[PDB]
Structures are given as structure tokens and as C-alpha cells.
Amino acid sequence: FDLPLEELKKYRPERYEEKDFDEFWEETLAESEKFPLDPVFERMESHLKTVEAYDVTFSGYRGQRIKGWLLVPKLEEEKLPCVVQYIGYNGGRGFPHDWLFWPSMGYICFVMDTRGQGSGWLKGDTPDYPEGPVDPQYPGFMTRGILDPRTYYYRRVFTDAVRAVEAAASFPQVDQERIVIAGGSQGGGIALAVSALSKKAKALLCDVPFLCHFRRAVQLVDTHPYAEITNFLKTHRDKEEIVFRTLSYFDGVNFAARAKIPALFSVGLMDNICPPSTVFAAYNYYAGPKEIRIYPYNNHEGGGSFQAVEQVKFLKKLFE
Amino acid sequence: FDLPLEELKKYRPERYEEKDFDEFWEETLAESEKFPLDPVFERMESHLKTVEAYDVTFSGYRGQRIKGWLLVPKLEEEKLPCVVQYIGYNGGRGFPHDWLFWPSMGYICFVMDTRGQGSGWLKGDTPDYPEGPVDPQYPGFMTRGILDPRTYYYRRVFTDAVRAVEAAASFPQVDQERIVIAGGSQGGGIALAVSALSKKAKALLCDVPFLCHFRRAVQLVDTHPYAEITNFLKTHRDKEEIVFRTLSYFDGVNFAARAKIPALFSVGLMDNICPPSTVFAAYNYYAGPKEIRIYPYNNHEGGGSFQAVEQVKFLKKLFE
Amino acid sequence: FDLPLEELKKYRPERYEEKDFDEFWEETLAESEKFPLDPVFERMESHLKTVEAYDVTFSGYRGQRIKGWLLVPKLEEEKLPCVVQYIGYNGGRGFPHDWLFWPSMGYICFVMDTRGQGSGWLKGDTPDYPEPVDPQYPGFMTRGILDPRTYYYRRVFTDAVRAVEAAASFPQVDQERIVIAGGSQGGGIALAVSALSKKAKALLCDVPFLCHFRRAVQLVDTHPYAEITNFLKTHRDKEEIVFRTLSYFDGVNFAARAKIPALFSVGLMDNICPPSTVFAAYNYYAGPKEIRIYPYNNHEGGGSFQAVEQVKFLKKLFE
Amino acid sequence: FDLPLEELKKYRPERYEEKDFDEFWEETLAESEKFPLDPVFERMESHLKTVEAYDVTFSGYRGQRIKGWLLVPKLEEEKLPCVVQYIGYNGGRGFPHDWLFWPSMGYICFVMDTRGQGSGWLKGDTPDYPGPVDPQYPGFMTRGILDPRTYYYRRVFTDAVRAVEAAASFPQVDQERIVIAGGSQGGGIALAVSALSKKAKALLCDVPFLCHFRRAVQLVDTHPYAEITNFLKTHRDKEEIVFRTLSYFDGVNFAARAKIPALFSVGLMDNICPPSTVFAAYNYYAGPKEIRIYPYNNHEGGGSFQAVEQVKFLKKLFE
Amino acid sequence: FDLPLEELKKYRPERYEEKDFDEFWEETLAESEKFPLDPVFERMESHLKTVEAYDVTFSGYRGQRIKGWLLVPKLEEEKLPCVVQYIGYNGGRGFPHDWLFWPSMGYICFVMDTRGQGSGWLKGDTPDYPGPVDPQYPGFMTRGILDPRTYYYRRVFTDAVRAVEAAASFPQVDQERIVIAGGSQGGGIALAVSALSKKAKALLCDVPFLCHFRRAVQLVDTHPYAEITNFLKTHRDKEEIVFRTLSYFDGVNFAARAKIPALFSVGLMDNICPPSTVFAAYNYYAGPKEIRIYPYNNHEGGGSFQAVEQVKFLKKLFE
Amino acid sequence: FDLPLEELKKYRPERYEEKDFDEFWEETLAESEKFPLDPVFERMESHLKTVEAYDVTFSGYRGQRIKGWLLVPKLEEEKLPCVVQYIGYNGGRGFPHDWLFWPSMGYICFVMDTRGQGSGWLKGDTPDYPGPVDPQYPGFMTRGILDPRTYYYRRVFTDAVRAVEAAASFPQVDQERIVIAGGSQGGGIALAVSALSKKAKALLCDVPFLCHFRRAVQLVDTHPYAEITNFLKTHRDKEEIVFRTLSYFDGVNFAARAKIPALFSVGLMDNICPPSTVFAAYNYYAGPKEIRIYPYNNHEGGGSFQAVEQVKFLKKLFE
């Protein structure tokens, strides 16, 4: 349904961002750095036998306390590499046993809970906090605070996500040389922002990323969650310019252009949640060393368990 | 798809409410009455010629400033009857010209904007304000603050709505003894709440009501917006009892049981958004003088323009 | 899903029409004009308080008696501007209270009931009368389609022309300020009247239907355009005749003849009336014109926002 | 989705008809018999080799001229049994070769075209003739529904009775072995003819439509029964008048009067013609009768399996 | 939804086949020729009166016994032309009375049952006989797809070549007028036979399936092509193996080799067999050829209109 | 959409099985046990660090070689309890890392690959081995359904009984602490194993499929149950035969014979495995049992909540 692959590979749409993109993010991170990180780990009673699981609490956007899980495989290694895992839309940190892949592969896994979501396919425990009034919005998170980048939901998520990397680095068994940032769909869009904004992340795993190239996304598909923005615009007919202005500060394409760490991307050519031209726009602008795995017959599931093996091999080759 | 009509007409399921239902509502309304109502009626340059439209502002839940419209038909009579109109889900106050029916029929019309919504089919101008943290929720309004009645979204909307009647009553040209409360679907549910909670309403028009008999609604249909609650529960599998205890304080069946003012209901027997059994549970418990117009072949549109004429005739008879 | 906006704005494709288009319509109107208009306005008992409602009857196609409403706002004015309102597919005149917008804005509103429809979303009271009723697919789009002389829209468009003469006959109507308006089917009817009427002074044309039929069926499989496609799936031998008939009714061909000022609207995600069909008509429209473009709306177009634009537009025009 | 089979078999709900049901039909048929039948059989140049095909024209309702095909298998016998075939909703007579089953089984087949339809899945050549064509929902189900004298099926069912007279006029037809047959709309028409024709000798009634309307619209939201629901959703003041009209055309009411031997079929998962509507009709049917029950089939019913059952049923019936 | 027609007419994509395409088919066919054909025609008791029906069995792929019907019109001519009919996806030979068209037009019809299918819209009676039956997606499209030697259509296409020899062996068949025919799956089978058989005289290829697989799975998400997509969505490591296997069975590669006169049909709105897949095959077809193009039709194609075109085409070819 | 919870808890429909049910299974398992099990475990080079992964091969139905995974957590305890895991419809054994749950909780996990499937959502490596593969609807539900001796699940259920013996042969498995587990198709397979094998200590049976087939096809039209309905729609003469065969594989009949303690789960909104089908099995389940009821869940059931419940249930059992 989207551009053919030869064209996708060359797709570099003209970017749109405001003159103060970097200032906005510098100011955002400085204001939240005023609150102590205060990373707290507490060992959890669980039935897990090959992993030690910890409850995590750390200060994200403006000192607000975000939950997570830390999963440490029980191995002979002194320091271990770490994957910081960001979660898809409507998900949250779930149970420790929802995240066994990375620890089973010998990586500590830091799972960041997603403020105010956690109700659509995996439970969450962390609330959101608005900057004052909660404006008229379409159901969901995509238009929550959208009339101002200062009030916009993902300002708070992305800042949480940057602070999560610091929280993971605070656990002493984490090898700070081998902290990886990872996610699919919303988790991939979050990881992309972090790849530009964190100075602690060493590598990026970005699958079927959401939050990329919003302007094109709403022209290409009518699926959720991108349709929340379309549906908001269908009603608020006078707000096009302001909505896209706000979104430009959170667009993965604009972060990709600033990001310098090694990355492995994946895309499903039949994905109609995250259309391939949106994924390719981000990939093509990504300024670090990069590869992409392309799945021509997959929808939003992308490479699934095959991609998971690709990630393990990529990281092994990168860190050796 | 629902019970046959002969059974709908007798359907009076055991009600479920907590022992402190009334006290919850007394304390809520009392806390909000500590702020001055401070109703403002500012003439809005519209292009209307047979109606004068005022931009309304008034203090609803916890003094929060709620928007509305006040439309006055161009008639001499020093005191006119008044319809206070509440709005369907994802709607908001829109433009003054969106509400010309009741003014054209000789009634002043007070249209209350809906906090936080106004983004699905008609625009709105009024924000919500949470009680502190914005808990994990499913997209929309149905599960916003659902883990505690003190935090639940409809606490705030219902309080706004009671206060809206007071605001309408403040307008010098409104006949304080001919104040009707009205709405369809979400608007119907809010009106039904108001019909129990306000001391100032003279009659109820309650069309295809939503927010009624939640526990059964979600068994019968999988449509939105009731599906937001199902979908929350599909994830938060441990929260059934808490969710339904919270919803009990906002259930139109429990309000119907307390309401004493005359009412005209309507129902579409093929309505799969507000199932017939949910509307009939509310209607059958409704404690005031009452009549119901039944539309056997209609879905959620109910009686449409036909029902509007039934309303005009009902009020004329009542007020003679 | 259709051409990008930069291409829609330049989209002026080769028009298809027969050499006798104007003669067809001159002969149609002249034949119907032999019957007296006989416009009848019967004041009616109503619950309305700010508006006076009249039941209307007038002679449309071949003297057939078409219903309407006339809604007159109660204002201290010896003459008032007037909007002649045409109705969307499967609708009809409904109740007087269904049409309160234009009277509330200070316009007399003449609502024309639509022959034979009135059964999908708003009730109607006017029958159709055929020229035999040929084999057709369910609906109105293919009724009489094998010959322009028998086609359903010959009758509707005649009715609609006659409606404006009927409105002009009400004494309080300001004949310098008669507006023709409609959305979707209403807008396709309005485009035809904008070419054919001797009485209309402005056009409001929203998300128009009955435009560029040959391209519409290639772009969408929605109804009501799909009635045409489904007819042709069965009558495999009738492609050329069907498009020949439709060319006499195509809003793109009317637009090219129309001279009055116009305000259009279009939803770029409208899959009932695709944007390239709407832009074909708008771009060929020969009078002074403007268009409001709603990039995120489907067939609802600009909704209540566009209603505000209309009132502003007519106020400027007529001041 | 409907009643379980044990209950369907006992389902014999209270019938609804007006006091003048028989009078309505007697006068309808009397009036149409005033016009000469004038059945015209024109040998049609054909590529067919085992069958002789004829173009048929005959006088149906009020003398209106209806098309058909006559297909005669090339056999030695002087007189042949005959199946009068009625056609499903949105179909028409199509081509001669569309109807080869019955001829191949040694039966002359008279295929009646369906007035005004012919545009959904197979083409047709016969027009309808109404005077005013009232507001209606798209299609045939609500055409003229506010009065049984104007209703579309009054004309179809008359045409269908006249068809049997026309088939019987063909010299090679054995008038002792005239079968009336159809599926869905075809079946509902055949059910009416089983009560109204004095010439039909046996009925093949598959997955019948036009039965138990009031219950059909409560059970399913499919077309074409949904045309009726959608008309009532708009004309909310007309529920009584619509069902009164429909009572004169209801297969259940015809079934109670029909005397000829019949073979029915039903699909238990058919959501076009719900099984309760079909069993209501079957259970009231007053002639010698059998029903083939296909529990896993939708509207296709027994398909080719049923065709074999019909052949066997008629062989045994006719000795 | 596909290429516009002017581009379809010129669509001649680079073909993909392995170096050993012809050798694979020569060895396949030589191996199956080592088993005796042993055509068996058992005359059946039938209700049919204009046609003689035979129960057919013959040896297809590797001596496996395949069912069929032979329908002989009762005609004075002692040698008759013959159409060997292949059946659409999920069908099978059904009953003899399912196949009356060609015998009514004076052709012997040999209907080939389809191994292992017969369970979706018409029953069948013939099993498949594979070795191990590899992991597969539900259906026939992926059965044995990891190796052309194990692939399901190797066996169907061999059956189909053998069916033409079985038809030829019936004494009343005129071996100079054997036609091979099908639609959709039947048309892809017929197209393979048009390249592989030395006995067929003409090809009727309607809306052909089993063409240009690589592109089909990009254009549509419908079944049955979506079985291939779904297999690849799971077996993410097997893209190259899958399309290599499929290249031995692609109608486009057979069309390039076929020499006999052909009449194709295509529906421009067919989203089961997309127009670009059909035209790729049609444009490579190396024999004398024509195509009937149905711009408004989906997968039904020309339906009964095309059946007429077929009968005319063969009459002209053979006279 | 199904019975209310109060009725589901009381739903014990009359069972249907043939008089030779036990004999059929006795002979089936005896014939397969004549071939050596020959379990082979090969340590796999793996990226996994907390788990030792082994490629498994073993003899299932009639010596046929079935793949699997053996996942051993790296722990001190020399003899570990073991969960034998059966896979959902269209799945297969996938990668070792797809099955980390049970090993992470301290259990050796034996994952049985599913013959012939492995192509819908997780890839598989094991073929099926039928002679003739009868006419069937796409998928596995109707493969060999005309005889219980040839039916697909005869083979799978035998494989699954043999998997328990193959897990028991691994030296680090505590052969006295083996559990059988599955969701949907995996739950139906585990249920059969709960009746057929004497080795298992406990059953984990989530949203079970393969239960109460006769009722399943009346209640939902979803796949995979709809493959059966679809087969019956065409093979209209095979209802009795199809249900007789299925009675030998019906989870409700195996439940009646199972004695080991069980934890079931059910989604009350599951329209793949309807609640009445799951309750019919659960209600007839003869051993100590409990059911987790998820009223707001569809076929996902309890998901990770249910997994926690399983870990607790086994912990109590093996203390």
C-alpha cells in the first residue's frame, strides 16, 4: 500500500521542526534534572528461579516517580550488558515474567513502566500528571496536551525514558559501556527520542517505530493510534497548524537526524499501524551507524521471533 | 438482540449500590457549593437574528470554570421556560447555531460544555482537572479515575451539570419554575443524574440514555463507549469488584430510583450503543411521573426529529 | 487516497458532453414551463415561535406537484434574503423544525422535497412519476439511465429550477438575494440550478455529488456511486449508453455554464464524493468562486465550521 | 441464530391478515384477466443444440407485457411436463443458456422475467409500471408499500399467475404436469402462485423469501428484508400501514390456502431468509408437502443436492 | 485498484523461471506416462434426458486414479467436439447436472475432478496422494511448496494433461476439436495444459489464477493468494525457496510456451486475480489470442456474457 | 454471546461417543508403541545463557519422527519437574527462546512440535504423514474426517501421549513430576493426553479447543471450527459420519475419563472456543479440578494472570 521498496530506501522527505527544537529539549531535561534521580531497587519475592527480579522506582519528568522492573539473570559474569526496554501503546510494565527474553540471553533488562497507560493489553502501575488543565482531547494519549509542546503527553514520557537510562546505569552490575535502548512501535518511537537525547545509551534497537513522520502517517492510514490525531483534527478544524507544530518536537524523524549511536531497525512492508514510509523516513535520516531488517510480508508484527535473534547477533557483534 | 419488549417492560433487576451513595453525593455537592457560582453571560457576536447567544461561564466541580451557551429566542415574555441541554460522548458546546431547536420553540436553551471532551464530533472549550495523579486508564473518559469514586471523571461532570441548572436559573429571563433538563445518550445519563441531584429542575427529557446499568451493558454489546470498561477489565483482571463499586455511584438506575420530577424517556429497540435492557432498567426504576416513547426499528438515533416533536408536546401539556 | 492537493488544484480534465446538452435542457425546461407554476404557500399550525412555517406546493417537472417548506423568520423586515435548500440522497423535507439554521440567521428558507426519496435518514412526502420504469439497480442513480429523457435526475433538476421560481413568488422574498444551497446530492442539484436558473444570485455547494461520474466509479466503491457500477456489472453491454446519459447530468458540465458567485467546500478524505470529482467541478466553475478545503474531514466536510463560512460569505457578497 | 429445529418444526404462529385478503386478490386477478393474454413465442436463433429456445411475451398485471424464455428439450414425446421458473431478487431472465437444468431433465421450462429488476446479478428486459411512485427506500421491497393496491409485489405476483397461463398455452405442454418453482424471491413468488393460480399442479419452494415479514425484520439485519426496516426507521408513523400492506403478500398467508403438492427446502443458517420465516410458511402450507432441511447451509440451501431431490419428488408425483 | 488499462495492455514484466523449467516438466510427464492411462467410462443411471452421463476414472500423476464426469449430448453427429473442464479452487466434480452448458451447446464435456479439494462450494470425490506432508498454511497453495517435486500443483497439472488424453480416448470425441477450459484455478490449470499437452486444440482461459504469484501477493490480500503471504509471514527465511518453487507453476511461464488459439477474459475490478497478473499471462501468451475485458466486473468476470463469447469463438475457429 | 455464567456452571449436555471409544484408543496406542520411542536429544548451540536447549526427536504416531524442544534451566537440583507443552492451531515449535516461561520458573519444558502445521503464527518443522488425503476443506480440522482411523488428530494425540514418554527419558527430568499443558488447540491436545496417558501428574488446560464440536459449529462461525461447518455445507450427505468421527476426539469425552488434578481457564467472551464448549468439558472432567473464569476476556483468556495461577497451582501440588 505504501511506496515500493526502491523508493522507500531513498525516501528523505523535507524535515519540519521549529527553530527552538534543541532548546525545548535542553530546557526540558535541565528542569527535570533539578529533582534527584533517587533510583530505588527492591528485591521482589517471585517464583522466578533463573532471574533475580527487582521493583524499580526512579524520578522521571519533574521528579514524578516512575515504576519499572529490573531483571538480572543469575550468571557467573561480574558486570552484565543491559537492555532498557520501552513498551508499546496501551501497555505497561506488567509482571516480571513478561520480560524474560533479554535476561535469558544474558542481559540485565530494565523495563520502564509507561505513565497513565497500562490498560489496553498489559497492566501498568504508573500515573500521569498533567501541567494544569487537561484540555479537550480525543480518547487516548496521542492528543493529550497537543495544543502546546510544553503540555504534550510525550514530553513527559520521553523525559521519563531519558531518566530510565540513568536509573539502569545506577544498578552496579550494569556495564555502562553496554547499555542498549530498545522498543517496538510506541517503544521504538520512545527509544528513538532517547537515542538523540541520552548521552548514556550505547546502542539502539528500533522495531516498527511509531511516533515518526506524523503528517504523512495521518494521510496514509486510518488505523489507530495515528487516527486519534486525524479524529481530533476532524473536529478542531482550526487547529491543524498548532497540532503539527506541537508534534514536530516529538517526531522520531527529527530525533533520528540527531542520533549518533549504532542502531538496528526493523520494518514490516505490510504494516498499516506504522506505515513503511514513516519508518523509512526515520531510518534514512538516522545519523548513527545503522542497519535495517526488512520484512516484506509482515504487518505490524514485523520480524517477531526472527528479529529477536537478529538483535542478539547484532549486539554480540557490536560489543565484541 | 435484547429482551423482547413485553419482558423489557417488566425488567427490574436487583439494584447494586453502596450504603454511602447519598452521603457521597451530599458531600460532593456541598464541597462544590463553597465556591461562588459566578455565572457570566456575555453576548457573542454571532450572526443570529432570531436568537441572542451568550458565552456562558460558571463554577462547576470544585470551582472549576465551565463553558456553555445561553440562547434566548427574540420574544418579549419577561420570563421564558428553559431547557438545560447536556451533550453526547466526545461532544462539546460547539457553536451557538448548533442548538437552535429549543430557542425556535420558544425556550431559552442553556448548553453545558463537557469537561475534557469536545474532540470527536463537535468541538468543546472546557478542560478537565484531575484529583491528583491520572491513574492508568484505557483511552477515553469511561475509565478515567475509575479505581475510586472520589477520582472518577463523572463525579466532576455530574457536579458541573447540577451547577449548570443553578447557572441557568441565574439568568433574569428564565422562569425558575419551568427549567427542563435534557439530553441524549451521555447527555441522557448526565440528565438523569441531575434529575435526582438537583432541587431546581422541573422536568426531565431523557433520550436513549447512556451511563445506565454498566454491569449488564458490557455483557450485551461490544460497542464503544461501554467497551472502554470491558477493555480496561480485559487488562486489569483483578479489578472487577473495584470497577463496578466505583460505577455504582454513577449509574443511572440508582439515580432513577431517587428522581421525583416528571420525565419523558425514549428508547430505540435496536440501539446497540445503549442497549434496551439498560434504558428500561433506568426507566422502570424512575420514581417520578413518566412516559416512554418506544422506537422499535430505530438504533441509537432513537426517535430523531419525531421524538423532538413528542418533547415539545409533552412540555406544553405539562406546563399548561 | 485521491490526487495530492497541488494536483487537485490544477485538475481540469477533458469534459465529456454531447453536442445537444444545451438543447436538451432548453427543451426540458420549456416543456415543463407550459404547466403553470401555481406556487401555493399554506400557513401551517406549528409549535415554532420565532419562525413562521408554510407548507409549499409547486409545479416541477411536467407539472407534477412537488412539496416543500417555507420557513420565515419573524423579523421587522418587509423583505428578506432567501436560501433555497436542496436535500441529500435518501432524504426528504422532514419537519419544518429540521431546517432552522437559515431562518435563525435571518433568511427565508425554501426547502425542496425530493421526489421519490424521503426514506433513509429523513422522511419525505413527494412521489416520483416516471416517463415504463426500466430494469434498474436499487436506488435512484440508475432509474431511467438508458436514456436522458427517462433519467430520474432530469426530473429532480427540473423540480429544482422551478423551486427557485416558486421561492421568488413569495412576496417577502428579496429577489436580489436568492441563494441556492446543498450538500452532496444537494450540491449536485444546486450546481445544475446554478447553470439553469434565471433567478439564483449565489451558490453554496458542499461536498458535491453527481460530479464526474466516470472517474468516481473508478476511485471508490462506496454508495451511492456504486449503484452505477453494479448496474454495469450486470448490463455489460451498456457502458457507452450509461455514460452518455450521465453526461447530461454531470455537475462538471453545469459548472462550466454557471455565472453566479459561489462558495464550495471539499473534504480531502471524503470517499463518497472523491476530491478529484469535486475539484473537477470547482475548477470548471465559471463564476466568481472560492473553496474551503478540509484536509482531515471525510464526507461531513466542514460541518458547522463551514456553516459559519457561508454566513460570512453571503454577508460580504450582499453588503 | 434462530429457534432450534425441534421448535421450528412446531412453529405455527398466529397469522395476521385483513378480512379482505381473498377479495383483494380475486378482484386483482379478475381485472388483469380482462386483457388478452396474447402469449407470443418467438423461436430465438441460438447456439443451443439439445434445446429449442423461444423469446416469450405475455400479458401480466393490467395487460403489461412481460418477457420470458421458453426452453424446450429436443425429445420425441408429443406432450412434456413444464416448470415455470421465477427468479431471485435483483435478477432477471438473463440468457436462454442460464436455465438449462429443467430442459436437460426433460421438462419444458418457462422462465418469467421480473418487472423492473434485472440489474444486480443477472440482466433483465422487463420494465415495471406503477401512477405516483411514492417515497421509498432503495429497491423493491418498499416500492408502493403504503397501500396494497400500489405495492410492487401485487404486480409481480399477478404477472406470475399469468405466466402459468402463458406456459399452459404452449401446445407441447402437458397441462397435468405444470410445476411452479423458485428460490428466495422466486420461492415467495411461487408460494403466492400456489394459492392463486388454478393451473399449477406442483410447487418447488426453496429458501423462500417474502414470508413472515414482521418477524423477519426482528431477526436479521440483512438485505433485502432490511429495506423494510430502514423505511420504518425513517417513516416512524407508518409501522401499522406497512405491515397491513405486507400482510396481503405474505407467503405464510398464501401457504394456508395452497392445495397442490409441494417440496420445500430450508437452510438452518440462512440469514437472508431466517428459518423461522420459512418454517412458518411450511407449517401453514395446506397441500401434501415435504421439506428438506439443510442444517449447515446458509442461503444457498441444498444447492445441487436439492435439485436432485426435486427431480425425484416430481418423478414420484407424476407416476 | 491495479494498473490502468492502457498500461495493462503493455504490461510485460521480466519473467522468472529456473534453467531446468522444461526439463522438470518433461521428466514429470515421462514419469507419469509409465503408468497406463486406463480411462474408464461407466455409463450411469441418470435422470438426465438430453445428455448421457458417464462416471470417469483415469490415471493422472503417477498412476493415481482421478475421478471425472463425461456428458455426451444425445445428437445424431457420430464424432462431437469436446471441452475438458477444470474446476475452480475448493470445488470438485459435483454432480453431472452441474455441467450442462457445453453439452447443451453440442459439446461432449469431460469434467476433471480436483485432487484433495471438493469441500468449499461443490463436492468432490478424488483424494490427493503426496511422502511427508510438510508444515503448511491451511489450503492447497502452500502444500509441498518447499520443493517443486513435492508441490501440490505438480500433481494437479499432470492430472490435467492426462485428462485431455482420457477425453481423447472416448470414441465419440472428435480429436481435432478438443478444447481445454477453466476459470480462476481452472484457468491457471488450463493455461499449464495449453503448454504441456500435445492434444488440446484451443484454450478458454477465464480470470486466471496461478499467474504471476510474486506480484499477486503485493497487490491483494485476498484468498487464495494470501495463503502464500501468510506462509511467508511465518517462514520468514523461505522467501527465495517459495518463489523458486512457484516459478515452475506460474501461468506466465506456461503462456510464453503455449501455441494454441486462446480466448481470455479479465475483470478489471477482480481483487482475487488482479488484472496485472492476468494481463502478464495474456501478454506473454504465444498462440493466436484475444481477450474480453470487463471493466466493471470483479472475479465473476464476464459471467454468462462471456459464455456466449466462448461459443462464438469456437464456432468460428472450428468452421 | 453464550449462556450466562449461572447456566454454564450447570451445563452438562448429554455426551455422545461410540461404544468402541476405549477400544479405538487402546488399539491406536498399542500399534504405535510397537515402534521404538527412540528419543534423541541434541544439545543446541544457542545464545541462551540461563537455559540449556536441546533439539528433540522422538517417535509419535506409528514411528513417525516428531520434533520438539527440551529447555533445561541452569539450576542446582539434579532432577527437575517438567512441563510438557502442546501448541495452538497453526503454530509450531518455533525457536527455543519462544518458550522461556516454565524454565525461568524452575521447570524443564518439553515443547512438542505439531505435525503439518507450523505456518500461521509460529514456524514449525515436523511434517504430517497420512496414503490417500481425502477431499477436505483447507486446514487440519477436516483432514481425514470421514474415518477416525484416518483423522488428523488421531495422529497428533498419539504424538502427544508419546511426548510424555519422551520427556520422561531425559535424565534430568523427574519422571514422577511431569505436567501436561496447552492453550486452545494445545488445551484440547492436553485434555486427550490427560485421559490417554498414565504418566502425567497434572493438567493445565487453557481456553480449550477440540471440545463439544457439535455445539461449537452452532454457536460461532469463527475459524477453526468453521472449517467443519464449511466441509458440511458442501458434503451435505456426511453429517452423521463427520460427527461420529469427531466423537473419538472430543475433549468432553476425554474429560469424563481423566483423573489427574487440573487447572482450567475460560474467557467468557471467547468466540474461538465458546464458553459452553469449554464448560461442557470442564463440567465432565472427572478429577480434582478448578477453573479460572475471566468474564471480560476473549480467546486470550487470563494471559499472564493465568500463568501466575499456574505457577501457584503446581507449587502447591509438588510441595
Ligand SMILES: O=C(O)C[C@@H]1C(=O)Nc2ccccc21
Ligand atoms: O503498537 C504498539 O505501540 C502496541 C499495540 C500494538 O502492537 N498494536 C496496536 C494497535 C493499536 C493500539 C495499540 C497497539
Ligand SMILES: O=C(O)C[C@@H]1C(=O)Nc2ccccc21
Ligand atoms: O452516544 C453518545 O453519547 C454520542 C455519540 C453517539 O451518538 N454515538 C456514539 C458512539 C460512540 C461514541 C460517541 C457517540
Ligand SMILES: O=C(O)C[C@@H]1C(=O)Nc2ccccc21
Ligand atoms: O450524501 C448524501 O447526499 C446524503 C447521505 C450522506 O451524507 N452520505 C450518504 C451515503 C450513502 C447514501 C446517502 C448518504
Ligand SMILES: O=C(O)C[C@@H]1C(=O)Nc2ccccc21
Ligand atoms: O435471495 C434472492 O432472492 C436473490 C439473491 C440471493 O441469492 N441473495 C441475495 C441477497 C440480497 C439481494 C439479492 C439476493
Ligand SMILES: O=C(O)C[C@@H]1C(=O)Nc2ccccc21
Ligand atoms: O476463484 C476460484 O478458483 C474459485 C472460488 C471463487 O470463485 N473465488 C474464490 C475465492 C477464494 C477461494 C475460492 C474461490
Ligand SMILES: O=C(O)C[C@@H]1C(=O)Nc2ccccc21
Ligand atoms: O487458538 C489456537 O489454537 C491458536 C490461534 C489463536 O490463538 N487463535 C486462532 C484462531 C484461528 C486459528 C488459530 C488460532
